[PDB]
Design a protein around this ligand. Structure first.
Ligand SMILES: NC(=O)C1=CN([C@@H]2O[C@H](COP(=O)(O)OP(=O)(O)OC[C@H]3O[C@@H](n4cnc5c(N)ncnc54)[C@H](OP(=O)(O)O)[C@@H]3O)[C@@H](O)[C@H]2O)C=CC1
Ligand SMILES: NC(=O)C1=CN([C@@H]2O[C@H](COP(=O)(O)OP(=O)(O)OC[C@H]3O[C@@H](n4cnc5c(N)ncnc54)[C@H](OP(=O)(O)O)[C@@H]3O)[C@@H](O)[C@H]2O)C=CC1
Ligand SMILES: NC(=O)C1=CN([C@@H]2O[C@H](COP(=O)(O)OP(=O)(O)OC[C@H]3O[C@@H](n4cnc5c(N)ncnc54)[C@H](OP(=O)(O)O)[C@@H]3O)[C@@H](O)[C@H]2O)C=CC1
Ligand SMILES: NC(=O)C1=CN([C@@H]2O[C@H](COP(=O)(O)OP(=O)(O)OC[C@H]3O[C@@H](n4cnc5c(N)ncnc54)[C@H](OP(=O)(O)O)[C@@H]3O)[C@@H](O)[C@H]2O)C=CC1
Ligand SMILES: [Ca+2]
Ligand SMILES: [Cl-]
Ligand SMILES: [Cl-]
Lengths: 284, 284, 284, 284
C-alpha cells in the first residue's frame, strides 16, 4: 500500500509517522519544503511538486488549514488528479466541501471528506477517530490504510457530513476552551489564582456533559419544562457573569453572546421555560 | 437544630427537603406562597412574613434569583436581622455580594456568601459541593448543618470569593450548554439528527477538560508555543463554524464571540502561537 | 379525529384517557369487557366486537401483552382490516413484528410498529416518547394524533426497528430491576437493611450510565485497553458476588450469567483487556 | 503523615497520587515492580519487600484483586504486621473479609475493610466515596488521611459490612454494564448502530433508578400490587428479549437469567403481581 500526504503541519506529520509505522509507503509534499526534514528522516519521500505527489499514490490525504489551500496546491495538477481518491481531512464549511466534491469530480478525482477528532499526539492511538463521508465503495477500499489514523466513523454519501460533524464538534471544543479563558480571566482580574479553579472547572465540565441527553430530548420535543431551572434564573447568572467581567475589566464578547441567548428567549416569552427553550432563538 | 430558608425555587425546596431529612426544624418564606405547598407538606413551617421567617432561627439561608431579591425581601426586615447568620446561596456579582456584606453588618447580621455547584436533584448527593466565603468562625459554627447540602469548600474571609468562583464556574457551565445548542442547531439545520452527536460531544468535552492544567501554566507564563496547534489554524475553524452556521440559517452570536477572540489574538501578532495566546485579548 | 384502542391494561387505559383529553373520539375493545368501565365513564365507547372497533376508526392502536394476542383478537376481523392503519404498541421480537407486517398487509392493513418508553402514569407527560417504524407516509398522517401519547421517535421503514429498540431498552431496564433485587437480597440475607443501600444504588446507577460512551466506542473499535480496569479484576468481583450470594442463600442466576461473561472473555485471552472485551463473547 | 500502599493497579496508583498530592509520605510495594515506575517518578518510595513496606507506616492500604492476594503478599510478613492498621480496599466476600480480620488480629494488626465506589480517575474527586467497617476508634484515628481518597461512609464494627455494601453496589454496576453490552449486541446483530441507543439507555437507567424506593417498600412488605405492570407482562418482555437475542445470534446468558426470575415468580403464583414479586424467587 502507497499513500500521499499533502500538508505537514502537526497533523500531517503525525499521519505520515503512523502510516510509515504501519508499513505504508508515504510520499509527502509541503509548501514549506524544510518542514519535511523529520518525516524524510523517518522514510517519507519528499516530492518536488504536488503533481509528482499525486503520481506516487492512488490515496492522497490533504491536511491543510482550509479547502482554499487544496485549490492553491492542486489547481495546477491537471490530469494528475484523474482517478485519484482525495481524502481531505481539513477544516472548512459543509458547502465548500460539497463544492470541492464537484471541482474534484470535473477532474476525475473522488473526494472523501473527513475530520480527525484528536490532536496530533493522539493520532493513531486507541482514542483517535475520524469522521468520513463521500462514496462508500471508494472509502471502503481505502479504509484498511485510513483506519491506522483512527477509528473510521463513516457518516454517509453527502461529502458535507464529515465536515458538518467536525464543525459541530469544534463548536463544542473551541467554545469550551474560550469559556475556560473567560473563567480564568475573571479570577485573575479579581486577584484570585486560576489554578485554584482547575478541579472545580473539571467537575462542572463533567456536569455540563451530563445535560446532553436532556438537551437532545427537550429540543427534539420543543418541550422546555422549567421545574428545575428557568431561562430567567439562568439568564440572571448570564447577566451576573457579564457584569462581573465588566467590573473586572475582562473581555465581554463570550458572556455577552451567552446573555443575548437568554434575553432573546425571555423576550420571546420563555422566562418560565428551561434553558433548552434557547433552541427557539438559536435553531434555523 | 433550627434553620430558615427564604426562596423556594427548585434549589430552596431541595435544601429544605435535605435539612428536613436530617431532622432540622425548617421555617420557610416565599413571595409566591403556593411554592411552599410541597415543603409545608413535608413539615416545613410557612412564616407569614420574612421578619417572622428570620425570628425562627439563628441560621438563615437565601436561595433567590439575585441579591436585589434579597433587598426586596429583607428591605423592611430591620431588627429581625440582628444577631442572625445570612447564608446567601444566590447568583450575583462579587462587588454586589461585598456591598451586601456591608449592608447586612450595619443591621447586625453576618453574611456567609456561597454558590451551590450542582442542580437541585443532586443537592445532598455525593457530587454536591458549595463554595463559602466570609468570617471563618461563623461559617464553622453553622457548617455541621450546612454540610447536608453538599461538601463545604470554604475559600476565605472575602465575601466576594464564593460568588467569584460560582460566576467563573457558571461561565464554563452556561457557555458549554450554549455550545451544545449551537452544535445541535448546525446538525438539525442541515437535516442531520442532533442525537447522533451526543457521544462525540461528551468525548470532546472530556478532551477540552484535559487542557485545563496547560491553560493555567501557559496563561500565567504568557507562554503560547504553537507547535501542536496555532491560533491561525484554530481561528480558521472558528471562522468555518461561523460560516457553516451562516449557511444553515442558525444564530451566529456564540460562534461570532469565539471567532472575535481568534481575530483579535491574530491581529495582536499571535497567528503562530497556541490558542492559549487568546489570554492576551480575553484577560484585558 | 377518531381512534380505536384494543387492550385496556394500564397502558391501553392511559392512552384512551390522553386521546380523550386531547379531543379524539375513542372506540375501545377489551377481552375483559368489565375493564372498560372507567374509560367508558370518561367517554370512550365500548364496541361489542373487534370488527366493530375496526369500523369506528382508520387509526387502530393495539396495547396487548404480545403480538400473538393481536392474531387472537383480529384473526376474525376479515375485510374489516382492509385500509386500516394498525399501530401495534405491544412487546414482541423484531421477527414476529415483520411477520405481522406481512400478515396485516395480506388483509389490506398497514402496520406501524411502536414501543412506548414510559410506564402508564407518564403516558402523555413531557417525558413520554414512543419508537415507531413502518411506512413513513402512513405514520406521518397519524403522527398528529399519536404524538399526544408521547414524543414520536420514527426510526425508519423496517417494521422490526421500533421493537428492536424497545427490546434493547427493556434489556437495560428489566436487567437493572433484577440487579436491584439481587443487591437487596444479598443485604437482607446478611441481616443488613436494603433501605440503607438506596442512596448508593442511585449513585452507582448514575456511574454505570456514565460508561455508555466508552462502551459504544471500544466495542465499535473492538479496542479494549485495560489501563483503568481489567476483565480479570472485574471478573474477580463477578465471582465474589456469586460466592457472596451462595454464602447468603440467595438466587444465583443473575450473578452466574454476569460471571460467565468474564470467564468466557478471560478463556478467550482478554484477562488483561477492559470489561468492554466481553463484546467478543456477547455480540453476534 | 505516613502511609504504605500495597498493590499498584489503577486504584492503588490513584490513591498513591492523591496521598502524595496532599503531602503524605507514601511507601509502596507491588509484585510487578515496573507498575511502581509512575508513583516512584512522583516520589513514592518502592520497598524491596512487603515487610519493608509495612515497617514504613502505621497505616497500610491494600488495593489487590482479592483477599487471597493479601495472603500471598503478607503471608510471610509476620512481625511486620504487629501494631499496624491494614485498610483493605479489595473486592472479596463478606465471610472472607471477616475471616481476614481474625487472621490479622492474631498477628497484632487491625483490619478496616473498605470499598471505593468510583473508578481510578475519580479517586479524590467530588463524587468519590468509600465504605469502611471495623473498629470505629481505629478508623477515626486514620480517617483524616483516608478522607483524601473520597468521602468516608463508616458502616459499623462488622468488618464484612463495607465488603457487603461494595458487592451489592457492584451487583448493580457490573450487571448494568452487561445489560448495556446486551442491548448494544441486539442492535448491532440486526444491523442498527448501537450508538443510536445511547441517550435512550441513559434515560431508561434514570427511570430504573426512580423505582428504588418502591422496590424497598414492596419487597420488605412482600406486597406486590400488579395494577401498573404484572410479572406476566414484564415476563413476556423478558422472553421477547431472549427470543430476539436468539433470532439475532447474540449470547442468551444474561436475558436467560432475568427471564428465569419471571418464569419462577409466575410459576410460584405471582403472574398478576408487580415485578417486585420476583423478591419471592431471588431472596431465597
Ligand atoms: N492541530 C490539531 O490538533 C488538529 C487540526 N485539525 C485540522 O487539520 C488541518 C491541519 O491542521 P494542523 O496540522 O494543525 O496544521 P496547520 O493548519 O497549522 O497547517 C497545515 C498545513 O497547511 C498548509 N497550508 C495552509 N494554507 C496553505 C496554502 N494556501 N497553500 C499551501 N499550503 C497551505 C501549511 O503549509 P506550511 O507548512 O508551508 O505552512 C501546513 O502544511 C486543519 O484543517 C485543522 O483544522 C484537526 C484536528 C486536530
Ligand atoms: N436551579 C439550579 O439548578 C441552581 C440554581 N442556583 C442558584 O440558586 C438561586 C435560586 O435558584 P432556583 O432555585 O433555580 O430559583 P429561581 O432563581 O428561579 O427563584 C428562586 C427564588 O427567588 C425568588 N425571587 C426572585 N426574585 C425575587 C424578588 N425580587 N423578590 C422576592 N423573591 C424573589 C423566587 O420567588 P417566587 O417563588 O415568588 O418566584 C424564588 O423563591 C439562584 O441564584 C441560582 O443561580 C445555583 C445552583 C443550581
Ligand atoms: N405497563 C407498562 O408500564 C408498560 C407496558 N408496555 C407494553 O404495553 C403492552 C401492554 O402492557 P400493559 O398495559 O401493562 O398490560 P398487559 O400486558 O398486562 O395487558 C394488556 C392487554 O392485553 C390483553 N391480552 C393479552 N393477551 C391477550 C389475548 N391472548 N387475547 C386478548 N387480549 C389479550 C389483556 O386483556 P385483558 O384485560 O382481558 O386481560 C389486556 O387488555 C405490553 O406489550 C407491554 O410490554 C410498554 C411500556 C410500559
Ligand atoms: N479499577 C477500578 O476502577 C476499581 C477497582 N476496585 C477494586 O480495587 C482493587 C484493585 O483493583 P485495580 O486497581 O483495578 O487492580 P487489579 O485488581 O487489576 O490489580 C491490583 C493489584 O493486585 C495485585 N495482585 C493480584 N493478585 C495478586 C496476588 N495473588 N499476589 C500479589 N499481588 C496480586 C496486582 O499485582 P500486579 O501489579 O503484579 O499484577 C496489582 O498490584 C480490586 O479489589 C478492585 O475490585 C474498586 C473500585 C474501582
Ligand atoms: Ca463528595
Ligand atoms: Cl460530603
Ligand atoms: Cl468529601
Amino acid at each position: 500500500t502507497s499513500a500521499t500526504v499533502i500538508g505537514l503541519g502537526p497533523m500531517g506529520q503525525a499521519m505520515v509517522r503512523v502510516l510509515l509505522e504501519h508499513g505504508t509507503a508515504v510520499t509527502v509534499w509541503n509548501r514549506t519544503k524544510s518542514r519535511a526534514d523529520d518525516v524524510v528522516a523517518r522514510g517519507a519521500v519528499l516530492a518536488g511538486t504536488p503533481a509528482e505527489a499525486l503520481k506516487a499514490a492512488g490515496l492522497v490525504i490533504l491536511s491543510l488549514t482550509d479547502y482554499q489551500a487544496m485549490y492553491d496546491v492542486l489547481g495546477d495538477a491537471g490530469e494528475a488528479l484523474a482517478g485519484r481518491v482525495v481524502v481531505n481531512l481539513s477544516s472548512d464549511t459543509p458547502q465548500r466541501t460539497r463544492e470541492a466534491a464537484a471541482w474534484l469530480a470535473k477532474r476525475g478525482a473522488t473526494l472523501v471528506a473527513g475530520g480527525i477528532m484528536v490532536p496530533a499526539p493522539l493520532v493513531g492511538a486507541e482514542a483517535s477517530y475520524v469522521f468520513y463521508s463521500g462514496p462508500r465503495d471508494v472509502f471502503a477500499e481505502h479504509e484498511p490504510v485510513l483506519r491506522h489514523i483512527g477509528r473510521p466513523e463513516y457518516l454517509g454519501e453527502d461529502h458535507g457530513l464529515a465536515q458538518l460533524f467536525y464543525q459541530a464538534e469544534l463548536t463544542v471544543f473551541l467554545t469550551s476552551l474560550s469559556a475556560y479563558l473567560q473563567a480564568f480571566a475573571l479570577l485573575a482580574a479579581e486577584g484570585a489564582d486560576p489554578a485554584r479553579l482547575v478541579p472545580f472547572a473539571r467537575e462542572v465540565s463533567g456536569l455540563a456533559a451530563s445535560y446532553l441527553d436532556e438537551t437532545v430530548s427537550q429540543t427534539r420535543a420543543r418541550a422546555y419544562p422549567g421545574d428545575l431551572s428557568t431561562a430567567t434564573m439562568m439568564g440572571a447568572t448570564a447577566e451576573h457573569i457579564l457584569q462581573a467581567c465588566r467590573d473586572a475589566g475582562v473581555d465581554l464578547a463570550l458572556p455577552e453572546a451567552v446573555k443575548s441567548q437568554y434575553d432573546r428567549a425571555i423576550a420571546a416569552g420563555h422566562g418560565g421555560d428551561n434553558w433548552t427553550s434557547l433552541w427557539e432563538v438559536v435553531a434555523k
